[PDB]
Design a protein around this ligand. Structure first.
Ligand SMILES: [Mg+2]
Ligand SMILES: [Zn+2]
Ligand SMILES: [Zn+2]
Ligand SMILES: [Zn+2]
Lengths: 112, 69, 86, 115, 559, 46, 140, 266, 155, 49, 140, 244
């Protein structure tokens, strides 16, 4: 991959780095394998991120996945719209789904 | 169903040339292009009026009249 | 009345919102249509909405907006003291 | 059905006048004439004739909507020259030109034989 | 869901929509028959007693007229069957249900209506015929065309909702959408194609047409601009006339690739005080793009001025294009002989490369790409070779197209089409794919009963070597149809599934609102955000800007 | 009338993609004639 | 006489078919305008297509030059051709249908198809030959 | 007389081909627009059906009858029914034609426009008669009958203009061209390799000299010398189409002049 | 460096230059003290929250951190005097507009931003190695325990 | 030009749309997904005409 | 009014580009070796060839006697006298940029309805060129 | 529509003297936008027009079967033999002014079809009209003077606009609006109101002085009564018992 890291002069230059991409997820175990940078490991499944790193980490991961889906087709949406959706999905301490088993099980009035 | 009176595009009278067109095709053994020009139809708007007309009234006249006098 | 915040500690915006302007114009326009006394000079105008707009521009709408807070408390803001900048 | 009657194109209605002349405030000595029950036929002809007058500074016409048979004509003349007089002169020029054309065609036609 | 969350309503209308270049952005054309059925209850006041009296006298069969009279006691009088006693005497506080007249605010909607710009408020314009009429620039927010679409009209019934409708939902207030903090409306189609043609350097206009073009702009101040060329003949450039429609005091600068102050290719954009200095006006300027002319105008001068900009540009460009003309025919899809020869050999070279990889694979000398099977790697190579062949052939065809080519003209304006359309029409349709793969062996070891078993050549697995101009062969026709069927199925399934997703999203977030304490809360009062968007701003007022301290070297930062 | 007299229908638990235009359909059902709605690929024409 | 043969999809799995007898059957400059045809250079053909055009149905056999169109457009026309007014029957004056539409002056297309000869589209046509201009005239 | 000039190249009873010189383009365009849309003409406008046992509909037959060209030489002696003092129609503003056809024979019998009979008082005018413009003497093929079918109807012909309905138009296609060599550069010729080889030369190119092959563009030249061919449907002579088009245009300008005068007094 | 932010400062500077007809040759009358203090006190008027306690004041400061960074980068002493050549009148005009523009960009209380966000996310979904598009979106909204193509990125 | 091929029931023309089914008396072998104890299955829907 | 800049140039080259009526010409002054001209010219009305000598003049107004949307443009009348009478090609445009090229070299950019001009020269000969509207007069 | 998926409605009609014309005097019967061509890649539409133009000029039936030896270049040669531009372009004139159009127009015959959808069978408006017996809301169907559905998606859009009063008016005054009397003790719609005698009573609560009238949609009244049939008690109360 190509990542832009600040140069010793002070400018941003793209230097290549070797990245391992995987089929399957074992985040807890892989994060401990020596040689990797455990402060940068990322997982496609934000559920594993929430289980290992916490709700706030899952909140950031959930936004990243949603942002990627929107931008994969080239469309752009403002940050606040996606941020609000992810905040609602994480406001109760866990990942609440947008199905009838998630947000529809709150305490918001039967008529709603 | 029957021949239009006028050309749709320019309004030239073409409803007085159907029988002349058919007679040229049948007895004079003319090609349809030559017959169209012999009738004085020069603009292709008028040519397609006579060239693409389907005479359905002949089919309708095969049914016996609903009300005979 | 513990839910009426005194005027000296109101923490809401000093600006009229778009929804506040829309309802004030509609509220005063409806009143004008019902033969309400107009407090602005008319140089020739029959549409109640345009008369209301003239009143809002000259700050002659005798209404106050009771802004509600998510805990039930409210703040009273006069249409004359609210800045119409939008 | 909402099809307007086709005679509304040329037949002038009740309480409706052929001409409506109103001064133009955007420039001096300018006027806007609204023609009723007319189309590009007169607007183009009148506007073109006006543009041949040296005492006319602006001449343009537009048909705002093709649904309604009316066009506006904006004329601005030099100071001391009345736009109505400019329209009068242009209309006279068209009439005289058309009269000459009719005579020329008739005299030329009388010389033919096939018809 | 069927009777409470949504229901059928009174005082509404539906019919087919048409496009009117001569209507203002916020105007809607209403058929006269509809205007006679729909009514507005107007209260009798000293300011409208005489007008309402005449409307009552007119009766319910003449627009502008009236249908009912409501007294202060609540009694409603049908003006039909009421003339027996003569015209009624009106009193203050009464209501006259009269026909919807011109400039009445109405809500204009198109279903599915997936976002708030699909319901916008327009000003009524009563018109002949039986179709609704709307400006062309408002077709993109509605996602509407004129192939038969129908739209719904709703008439507010009170001064409250009537001012609410015109002060919150008016079309000019929706020009800059908050979804992507950029304009949602722009110049499109004919007006986008003509504006590109009108602003070329070769475009010069004479006095007679300039005067008519100036008069078509309603807000033209009556001052004739000095022609760009004074002698030997007074000629106005198209940029000069289009500048009359741009409000004064507007500045806009954009640089494209290779753009300089002396723009040799007339690209980029430079506008000072509402006058265009250089640059062709195309979708990057008058389209619904970030930082374009519409974005700058609507934020600098306001929404109402921007609405007038739409009409002024459309009127001046539509008039100019009406007398210039623009067409397109079969001749625009034909490349010259040398180009077709280069295209033919380009495809032949790609086919030879495919043959080379196939024969080495059949020799077992090809090594599978890491993490992939031999066959998958082989297919990846074949598809890459054939994909690049089509693109290269399309590039050869596109370069040959002259500046007078009409399809090329449309693409450059951004009005319609793209590079791929030119390539497929003129050079090569290319590889057909189903399920992101080549045509599969439906038959035993072959695609059709016209090849031999175990055939992997491009012609066997769905590579269309011909163009649309030259015609597909029967094998190509069937393979192309298979790919087309894939798109039709995808369109149907995704439409149903995305619709459910949209409803689920709306119902999950429907009760969230920004409160007067700047917090984002739901119906429970639970805090979702302690400040909206974490910055407290509205997306409709956000623009992309460069942070000048983060980037650059340290020396530049010091300097 | 002619098209309606030569239509075929397929009732859509199944594990397959019946809506697609299969290779075996060649010369047997029209590759182009199908509804654009929920019957796309399920209603075929000889 | 053994000159033609009925073949089903299952038997179609065991036969080799030639698209045309013009070029595929004979043992084996070119016009730059003609489409590129693949020979397939096989000497074991067992059958030959009567004509490739017969792969289409009733609705797609009215489209002129369907092989110069994008496939979805052909699908749209197949659906839309069934919504066009024409002469559905010649005895519409003795039938009592719920609804019926009859074109005043049905014309036959100037550009026709050979398959249309058997659909009776020249005897009962649905449409007219309009003089069409492709232009941006008034923005309407 | 020293104004617009006329030169007739080919004259016939159906077509007149002339060159209109020393004129403006606006005047030439208005002449053809008026010749197409504003020359009054007599045409069948209302039809009363007494018997219709044909295979065609009454509205179908009425539309055909309105499109039959009638003589309009003395159309100016007729009045507009809207401007006439009569209940429905009279001899001062209308012409009445009757059509009676019966299927007496076993073969198909054809109803032509020659079968229309004028039953009004023409008052010595020259209007109403259907135009017969073929060899056999028949007119337009109105309808076909089999044995036992009858068509009985009465037609009322009124004067109008093609602006109201195209049936009142006396002119077919009008040819109109200027500057066949494109010396004013009002067209930018689309081409592939060479535009001169790809665009056929107009027949009118023989009446003008070609460009001098290297001279600078003439920016002072204006369009004139228009080549026009007017076709007539036969209701009025083609020469009258041109003459009456000038008359109609002349009257329209005079009406504007008169309206301007009327406003001056008030 | 390109990020969405409320107020467009480049346009404001351009308007000031074209409105007051900056000479660009004669030196300005601005002072270094005026520039530095003018920007500093302008940053105080960028009010999103108006509470008079510590918690709200800290939130107010945090809300305008990025905008103030953009503000300070554009209205720098060297940039104002050397790049823009602004006059004292132009500088004061610029400060007033930034305050006016900023106060107009604030979110309006009573705005239904929830429905707005849902429609803004769902509308693009209608026009839509790993799963992408609608299937991936549908997999995210429904928190699927088993996703089609889970993956890890290891640096 | 009428071609037949339809029925008249209660005065209404009714066309019978051909119904597509899978042929009988043919052995078909399918693979089953991972979450199932059965990996492959050979099925025949025996039919007597 | 008065001439802000007059000089003589020798056209080094002419470039039509993608246009059929406008050519961008490169020219250099005949008396000064530090003055060059890039100019877009409507060559349909004023053809220009290489090796040509052009007298280029810039003026703030066209009326003869000094008189230092302004006013509505009107067609010239008979008896109208102005600077344009002495030249063949005249254009009216605006100056939109002043660029410092060197210590004493200054370049002024003009736009005549989209036809761009660039006048490079020493600081002491382009000192009367302001950021305003001006006329460009060219005489062969 | 044509035979190539190109369908459209009539935007406007023009008379002959307003249409663009050729030097021969031929005017179009129909004008379509060039923008319909490129994105859809219906090259057959343009080939048909070129073929039909040659067919009309020669008096023949054009062969448009898919897979044949007929090419565009062959048709182009035939068209030029007839004295026309080989690609189907013609020099046209503006109908309003008579000046030549700077561009040349692709012009020729094409087979168009009149579709079943006519606007006069779709246009319909309703101020007031019949209501359904059950829900007492506007009836369905244009043929029955019915109303239009203001559905959930429309409601969401109006919520996004903040037009609260308009949303209420659509759901109440443009549709079922019903007034009921509720009891202050029990929130049930069980109050017998003799409005002529100015008497109210809620038997079961034995009260006559604690009555209120509320404005709710008739569907809401129907919903609550249906819930009552299911033994559920939706009790409507006009004052709050718990703080926010
Ligand atoms: Mg549509
Ligand atoms: Zn014709
Ligand atoms: Zn009379
Ligand atoms: Zn009770």
């Amino acid at each position: 991959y190509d990542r832009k890291v600040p140069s010793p002069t002070g400018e941003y230059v793209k230097e290549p780095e070797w990245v391992l991409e995987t089929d399957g997820v074992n985040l807890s175990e892989v994060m401990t394998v020596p040689g990797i940078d455990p402060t940068r490991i990322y997982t496609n499944s934000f559920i594993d991120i929430m289980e290992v790193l916490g709700i706030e980490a899952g909140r950031a991961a959930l936004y990243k996945e949603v942002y990627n889906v929107i931008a994969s087709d080239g469309s752009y949406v403002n940050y606040r719209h996606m941020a609000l959706l992810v905040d609602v999905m994480t406001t109760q301490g866990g990942l609440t789904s947008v199905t009838r088993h998630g947000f529809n099980r709150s305490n918001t009035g039967a008529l709603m | 169903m029957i021949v239009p009176v006028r050309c749709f595009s320019c309004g030239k009278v073409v409803g007085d040339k159907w029988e002349s067109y058919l007679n040229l095709l049948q007895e004079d053994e003319l090609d349809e292009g030559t017959a169209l020009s012999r009738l004085g139809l020069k603009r292709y708007c008028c040519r397609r009026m006579i060239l693409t007309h389907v005479d359905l009234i002949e089919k309708f006249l095969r049914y016996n009249p609903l009300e005979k006098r | 009345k513990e839910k009426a915040i005194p005027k000296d500690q109101r923490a809401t915006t000093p600006y009229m919102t778009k929804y506040e302007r829309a309802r004030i114009l509609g509220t005063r326009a409806l009143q004008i249509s019902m033969n309400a006394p107009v407090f602005v000079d008319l140089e020739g105008e029959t549409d109640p909405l345009r008369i209301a707009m003239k009143e809002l521009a000259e700050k002659k709408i005798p209404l106050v907006i009771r802004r509600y807070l998510p805990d039930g408390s409210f703040e009273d803001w006069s249409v004359e003291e609210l800045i119409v900048d939008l | 059905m909402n099809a307007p009657d086709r005679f509304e194109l040329f037949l002038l209605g009740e309480g409706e006048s052929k001409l409506k002349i109103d001064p133009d405030t955007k420039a001096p000595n300018a006027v806007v004439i609204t023609f009723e029950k007319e189309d590009h036929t007169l607007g183009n002809l009148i506007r073109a004739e006006l543009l041949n007058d040296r005492k006319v500074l602006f001449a343009a016409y537009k048909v705002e909507h093709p649904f309604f048979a009316r066009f506006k004509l904006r004329i601005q003349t030099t100071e001391g020259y009345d736009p109505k007089d400019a329209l009068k002169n242009a209309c006279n020029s068209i009439i005289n030109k058309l009269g000459a054309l009719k005579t020329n065609f008739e005299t030329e036609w009388n010389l033919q034989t096939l018809a | 869901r069927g009777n409470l969350m949504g229901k059928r309503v009174d005082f509404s209308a539906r019919t087919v929509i048409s496009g009117d270049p001569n209507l203002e952005l916020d105007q809607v054309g209403v058929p006269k028959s509809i205007a006679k059925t729909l009514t507005y209850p107007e209260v009798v006041t000293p300011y409208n007693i005489d007008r309402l009296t005449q409307l009552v006298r007119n009766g319910p069969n003449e627009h502008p007229g009236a249908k009912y009279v409501i007294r202060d006691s609540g009694d409603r009088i049908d003006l039909r069957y009421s003339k027996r006693a003569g015209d009624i005497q009106l009193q203050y506080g009464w209501k006259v249900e009269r026909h919807i007249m011109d400039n009445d605010p109405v809500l204009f909607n198109r279903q599915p209506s997936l976002h708030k710009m699909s319901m916008m408020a327009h000003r009524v314009k009563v018109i002949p015929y039986s179709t609704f009429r709307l400006n062309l620039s408002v077709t993109s927010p509605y996602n509407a065309d004129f192939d038969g679409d129908e739209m719904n009209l709703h008439v507010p019934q009170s001064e409250e909702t009537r001012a609410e409708l015109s002060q919150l939902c008016a079309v000019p207030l929706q020009i800059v959408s908050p979804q992507s903090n950029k304009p949602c409306m722009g110049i499109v189609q004919d007006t986008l194609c003509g504006i590109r043609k009108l602003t070329l350097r070769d475009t010069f206009i004479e006095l007679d047409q300039v005067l008519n073009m100036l008069y078509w702009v309603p807000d033209w101040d009556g001052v004739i601009p000095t022609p760009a060329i004074i002698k030997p003949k007074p000629l106005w450039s198209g940029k000069q006339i289009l500048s009359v429609a741009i409000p004064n005091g507007i500045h806009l600068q954009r640089f494209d690739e290779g753009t300089t102050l002396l723009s040799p290719k007339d690209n980029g954009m430079l506008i000072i005080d509402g006058q265009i200095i250089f640059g062709v006006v195309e979708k990057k300027t008058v389209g619904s793009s970030n930082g374009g002319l519409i974005h700058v105008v609507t934020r600098e001068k306001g929404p109402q001025v921007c609405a007038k900009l739409f009409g002024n540009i459309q009127k001046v460009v539509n008039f100019w294009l009406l007398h210039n003309g623009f067409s397109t025919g079969i001749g625009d899809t034909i490349a010259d002989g040398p180009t077709m020869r280069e295209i033919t050999e380009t495809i032949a070279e790609a086919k030879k490369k495919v043959l080379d990889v196939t024969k080495e694979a059949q020799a077992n000398l090809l090594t599978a790409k890491h993490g992939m099977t031999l066959r998958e790697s082989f297919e990846d190579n074949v598809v890459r070779f054939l994909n690049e062949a089509r693109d290269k052939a399309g590039r050869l065809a596109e370069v040959n197209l002259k500046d007078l080519n009409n399809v090329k003209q449309m693409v450059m304006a951004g009005s319609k089409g793209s590079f791929i359309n030119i390539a497929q029409m003129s050079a090569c349709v290319g590889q057909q794919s189903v399920e992101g793969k080549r045509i599969a062996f439906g038959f035993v070891d072959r695609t059709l009963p016209h090849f031999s078993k175990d055939d992997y050549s491009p012609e066997s697995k769905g590579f269309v070597e011909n163009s649309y101009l030259r015609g597909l062969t029967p094998q190509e026709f069937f393979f192309h149809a298979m790919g087309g069927r894939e798109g039709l199925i995808d369109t149907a399934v995704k439409t149903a599934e995305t619709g459910y997703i949209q409803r689920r999203l709306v119902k999950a977030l429907e009760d969230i609102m920004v409160h007067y304490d700047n917090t984002t809360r739901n119906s429970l009062g639970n805090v979702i955000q302690f400040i909206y968007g974490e910055d407290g701003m509205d997306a409709a007022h956000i623009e992309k800007q460069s942070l000048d301290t983060i980037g650059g070297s340290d020396a530049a930062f010091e300097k | 009338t002619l098209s309606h007299l030569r239509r075929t229908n397929t009732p859509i638990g199944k594990l397959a993609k019946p809506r697609q235009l299969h290779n075996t359909h060649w010369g047997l059902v029209c590759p182009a004639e199908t509804p654009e709605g929920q019957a796309c690929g399920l209603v075929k024409n000889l | 006489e053994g000159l033609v043969e009925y073949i089903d999809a299952e038997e179609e799995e065991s036969i080799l078919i030639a698209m045309q007898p013009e070029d595929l059957e004979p043992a084996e400059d070119v016009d730059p305008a003609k489409r590129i045809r693949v020979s397939h250079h096989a000497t074991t053909f067992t059958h030959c297509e009567i004509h490739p055009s017969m792969i289409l149905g009733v609705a797609a056999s009215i489209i002129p030059f369907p092989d110069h169109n994008q496939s979805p457009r052909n699908t749209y026309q197949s659906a839309m051709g069934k919504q066009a007014m024409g002469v559905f029957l010649t005895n519409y004056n003795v039938r009592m249908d719920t609804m019926a539409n009859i074109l005043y002056y049905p014309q036959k297309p100037l550009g026709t198809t050979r398959a249309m000869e058997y659909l009776k589209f020249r005897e009962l046509p649905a449409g007219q030959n309009a003089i069409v201009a492709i232009a941006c005239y008034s923005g309407y | 007389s020293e104004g617009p000039q006329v030169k007739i190249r080919e004259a016939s009873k159906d077509n007149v081909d002339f060159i209109l010189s020393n004129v403006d383009l606006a005047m030439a365009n208005s002449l053809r627009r008026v010749m197409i849309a504003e020359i009054p003409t007599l045409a069948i406008d209302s039809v009363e059906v007494e018997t219709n046992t044909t295979v065609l509909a009454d509205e179908f037959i009425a539309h055909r009858l309105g499109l039959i060209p009638l003589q309009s030489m003395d159309i100016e002696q007729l009045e507009y029914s809207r401007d006439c003092f009569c209940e429905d129609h009279c001899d001062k503003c209308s012409v009445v034609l009757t059509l009676q056809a019966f299927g007496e024979s076993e073969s198909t019998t054809n109803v032509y426009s020659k079968d229309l009979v004028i039953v009004s008082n023409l008052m010595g005018r020259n209007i109403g008669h259907p135009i017969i413009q073929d060899k056999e003497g028949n007119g337009v093929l109105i309808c076909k009958l089999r044995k036992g079918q009858e068509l009985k109807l009465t037609c009322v012909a009124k004067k109008g203009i093609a602006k109201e309905h195209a049936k009142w138009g006396p002119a077919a296609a009008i040819e109109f061209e200027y500057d066949p060599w494109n010396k004013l550069k009002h067209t930018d010729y689309w081409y592939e390799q060479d535009s001169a080889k790809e665009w056929p030369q107009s027949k009118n190119c023989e009446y003008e000299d070609p460009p001098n092959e290297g001279d600078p563009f003439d920016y002072k030249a204006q369009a004139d010398t228009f080549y026009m061919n007017v076709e007539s449907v036969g209701s009025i002579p083609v020469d009258q189409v041109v003459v009456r088009g000038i008359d109609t245009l002349q009257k329209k300008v005079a009406s504007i002049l008169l309206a301007l005068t009327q406003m001056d007094q008030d | 460096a390109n990020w969405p932010l409320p107020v467009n400062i480049r346009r404001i500077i351009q308007n000031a230059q074209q409105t007051f007809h900056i000479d660009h040759t004669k030196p300005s009358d601005l002072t270094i003290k005026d520039i530095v203090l003018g920007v500093k006190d302008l940053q105080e008027n960028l009010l999103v929250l108006r509470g008079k306690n510590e918690i709200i004041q800290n939130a107010q400061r945090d809300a305008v951190t990025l905008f103030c960074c953009l503000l300070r980068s554009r209205l720098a002493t060297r940039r104002v005097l050397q790049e823009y050549r602004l006059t004292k009148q132009a500088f004061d005009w610029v400060l007033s507009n930034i305050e006016a523009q900023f106060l107009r960009s604030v979110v309006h209380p009573g705005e239904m931003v929830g429905v707005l966000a849902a429609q803004s996310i769902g509308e693009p979904a209608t026009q839509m190695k790993v799963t992408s598009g609608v299937p991936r979106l549908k997999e995210i909204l429904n928190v699927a325990k088993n996703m089609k193509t889970p993956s890890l990125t290891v640096y | 030009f009428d071609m037949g091929g339809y029925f008249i029931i209660n005065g209404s023309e009714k066309v019978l749309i051909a119904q597509e089914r899978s042929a009988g008396n043919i052995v078909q072998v399918f693979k089953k997904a991972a979450p199932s104890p059965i990996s492959h299955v050979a099925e025949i829907r025996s039919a007597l005409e | 009014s008065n001439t802000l800049f007059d000089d003589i140039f020798q056209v080094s080259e002419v470039d039509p580009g993608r246009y059929n009526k406008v050519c961008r010409i490169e020219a250099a002054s005949t008396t000064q070796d530090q003055c060059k001209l890039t100019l877009d010219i409507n060559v349909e009305l004023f053809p220009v060839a290489a090796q040509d000598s052009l007298t280029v003049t810039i003026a703030s107004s066209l009326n003869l006697e000094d008189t230092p949307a302004t006013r509505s443009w009107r067609p010239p009348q008979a008896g109208d006298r102005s600077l344009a009478d002495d030249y063949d090609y005249v254009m009216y445009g605006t100056a939109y940029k002043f660029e410092e090229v060197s210590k004493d070299l200054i370049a002024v950019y003009y736009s005549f309805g989209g036809l761009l001009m660039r006048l490079e020269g020493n600081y002491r000969n382009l000192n009367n060129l302001k950021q305003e509207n001006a006329y460009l007069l060219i005489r062969r | 529509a044509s035979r190539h998926g190109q369908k459209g409605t009539i935007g406007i009609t023009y008379r002959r003297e307003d249409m663009p014309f050729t030097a021969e005097g031929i005017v179009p019967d129909l004008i379509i936008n060039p923008h319909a061509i490129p994105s859809r890649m219906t090259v057959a539409h343009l080939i048909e027009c070129l073929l039909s133009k040659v067919a009309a000029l020669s008096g023949n039936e054009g062969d448009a079967s898919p897979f044949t030896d007929i090419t565009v270049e062959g048709i182009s040669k035939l068209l030029r033999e007839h004295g026309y531009q080989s690609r189907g372009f013609e020099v046209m004139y503006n109908g309003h002014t008579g000046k030549k159009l700077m561009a040349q127009i692709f012009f020729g015959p094409t087979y168009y079809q009149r579709l079943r959808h006519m606007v006069d069978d779709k246009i319909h408006a309703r101020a007031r009209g019949p209501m359904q017996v059950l829900t007492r809301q506007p009836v369905e169907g244009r043929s029955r003077d019915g109303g239009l559905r203001f559905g959930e998606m429309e409601r969401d859009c109006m919520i996004a606009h903040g037009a609260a009063s308009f949303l209420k008016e659509r759901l109440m005054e443009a549709s079922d609006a019903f007034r009921v009397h509720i009891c202050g003790i029990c929130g049930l719609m069980t109050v017998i109101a003799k409005l002529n005698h100015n008497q109210f009573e809620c038997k079961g609560c034995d009260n006559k002085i604690d009555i209120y009238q509320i404005h709710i949609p008739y569907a809401a009244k129907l919903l609550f009564q249906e819930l009552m049939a299911m033994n559920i008690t939706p009790r409507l109360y006009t004052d709050r018992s718990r703080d926010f």
